[PDB]
Structure 1
């Protein structure tokens, strides 16, 4: 009985580092500030807020697997007299989370790490190392229009005799009205959330 309370209290203590590393929050909060650096703004919109909008989105999609953890563990059928079936019982409790990490991690890196069905302890760095790599692909892709904007504004300035002026000023309006008329703020956020759940 008292081992269940120290285990839940240990989960409440470790909960910021698990949501900081283990779940899909790293796909959100990286690519959010990737757009701000793509636009060239430094402190706008002040990333304390942008971490908030990345947290409510990542919690909204992690919560259904978290709800499975209740209905497996709040029941009264936990009394197994032999300790190995109780061990396999709580193995099968985390099976939805383990299945989610297996769904989103690369295969051969996991078996390289458990070379030292797979253990949840081994695939955990293999999830994040693939996740930042998947965040940089859409970091490169979302950056890619604005370098075309940054070159075309210099070409029209060099077509004029305006070569002493830096083109950052004429680059910056069209590097954001090509974002709001495109409406990438609802396009990216909906595209990022449709990757996991289905409506």
Structure 2
């Protein structure tokens, strides 16, 4: 135990909610669940209190093995050795950011690998992937909205708005697929490597 080691231990516990917001996969999970809500056309339900909760719990399984490897390790008496010792600890996490980031971004940031270059390059990599999933979630329902509109014009109902009757169809389809069971599984499989 030393004062300077403790100061660095207290400070990391202040910055936690920011690192988990940028440096961890939590960004993919939070985004994906809100896009699901928007695709269904629901506007208040389920609450962001729930989605931001479940997404947080699932992401915990993926990161726990990474923190424990730093837990089981001390995370020795000289600047060069101390740097190597401390640096060697973060390297357990470096191997994560580099697996889910694009080489071209890191290289640009390496010229202004380093951790500071990996953090922003990683964030933009996870975000763009999330939109790549969301896009696919809209396709199975937008075809439903067009089909409902198409038939009513056969009946001559120029201006019976669709939404009063198409919204339940969206629910049965999502429920019949057990969507949440498929999405929550596939998301962890991208990382857990089971």
Normalising by the residue count of structure 1, what TM-score does the alignment of the two structures yield? 0.94
SS at match of 1:196: helix
**Cα shift readout 1:70-121 (whole Å, capped 9, x = no counterpart):** 1221xxxxxx2321121011111011111000011111100101110x0111
Mean CA deviation greater in 28-37 or 171-180: 171-180
Q: 2: CA distance between counterparts of 1:51 and 1:120?
A: 27
Q: 1: CA distance between counterparts of 2:18 and 2:124?
A: 16
Q: 2: CA distance between counterparts of 1:67 and 1:184?
A: 32
SS at match of 2:177: coil
**Cα shift readout 1:8-49 (whole Å, capped 9, x = no counterpart):** 101100001111111000000001000000101010101111
**Structure 1 segments (4+ residues) deviating >3 Å:** none
Unaligned runs of 5+ in 2: none
Q: Offset of 1:176 from its aligned partner?
A: 1.5
Residue 165 of structure 1: aligned partner: 160
Unaligned runs of 5+ in 1: 74-79
Q: 1: CA distance between counterparts of 2:30 and 2:8?
A: 29
Q: 1: CA distance between counterparts of 2:16 and 2:87?
A: 20
Q: 1: CA distance between counterparts of 2:135 and 2:42?
A: 17
Q: Offset of 1:164 from its aligned partner?
A: 1.2
Q: Offset of 1:60 from its aligned partner?
A: 1.7
Q: 1: CA distance between counterparts of 2:146 and 2:100?
A: 37
How many residue pairs get aligned? The number is: 192
Q: Offset of 1:198 from its aligned partner?
A: 3.2
Residue pairs, 1:32-111, within 5 angstroms: 32-73=33-74, 80-111=76-107
Q: 1: CA distance between counterparts of 2:181 and 2:163?
A: 26
Q: 2: CA distance between counterparts of 1:81 and 1:36?
A: 54
**Cα shift readout 1:112-150 (whole Å, capped 9, x = no counterpart):** 01110x011111011111111000000101111111111
SS at match of 1:175: helix
Residue 139 of structure 2: aligned partner: 144
Q: 1: CA distance between counterparts of 2:193 and 2:125?
A: 23
Q: 1: CA distance between counterparts of 2:71 and 2:140?
A: 45
SS at match of 1:166: coil
SS at match of 1:149: helix
Normalising by the residue count of structure 2, what TM-score does the alignment of the two structures yield? 0.96
Q: 1: CA distance between counterparts of 2:77 and 2:21?
A: 37
